[PDB]
Design a protein around this ligand. Structure first.
Ligand SMILES: *[C@@H]1O[C@H](CO)[C@@H](O)[C@H](O)[C@H]1NC(C)=O
Ligand SMILES: *[C@@H]1O[C@H](CO)[C@@H](O)[C@H](O)[C@H]1NC(C)=O
Ligand SMILES: *[C@@H]1O[C@H](CO)[C@@H](O)[C@H](O)[C@H]1NC(C)=O
Lengths: 49, 48
């Protein structure tokens, strides 16, 4: 199971980080890690396992 | 690690309590099997 509404406003919990927003598919290899966070501390994007 | 931390591609999935010894059961028919399995220690460095 991995429910993931794509293009609407939603709540979310990703790897113990919570919030609200909308999810966009991107094209970037970035195989270095699993989570990307901004300088402010708000996550910007994540990669599926 | 000796502490038992387990890291795949940088992130750490889980940490085992302790490891006395490690044995790697990897079998490759290819003669040019792999590049390296090494030991190492902590240090303080900078990176770009
Ligand atoms: C998660 O997805 C399944 C499959 O559509 C659905 O039955 C379930 O209700 C969903 N859960 C939520 C909280 O929407
Ligand atoms: C892929 O990503 C690059 C930069 O992120 C973008 O310029 C490009 O339009 C995207 N799509 C394709 C098909 O390359
Ligand atoms: C990587 O593997 C290739 C496979 O043939 C080998 O030729 C090469 O020497 C290796 N490079 C390393 C270990 O840096």
């Amino acid at each position: 199971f991995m429910n993931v509404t794509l293009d609407k406003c939603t709540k979310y919990n990703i790897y113990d980080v919570s919030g609200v927003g909308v999810i966009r598919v991107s094209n970037d290899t970035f195989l270095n890690g699993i989570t990307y966070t901004s300088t402010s501390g708000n996550l910007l994007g994540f990669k599926d396992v | 690690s000796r502490t038992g931390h387990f890291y795949i591609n940088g992130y750490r999935y889980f940490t085992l309590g302790n490891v006395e010894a490690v044995n790697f059961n990897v079998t490759t028919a290819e003669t040019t099997d792999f590049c390296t399995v090494a030991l190492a220690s902590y240090a303080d460095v900078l990176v770009n």
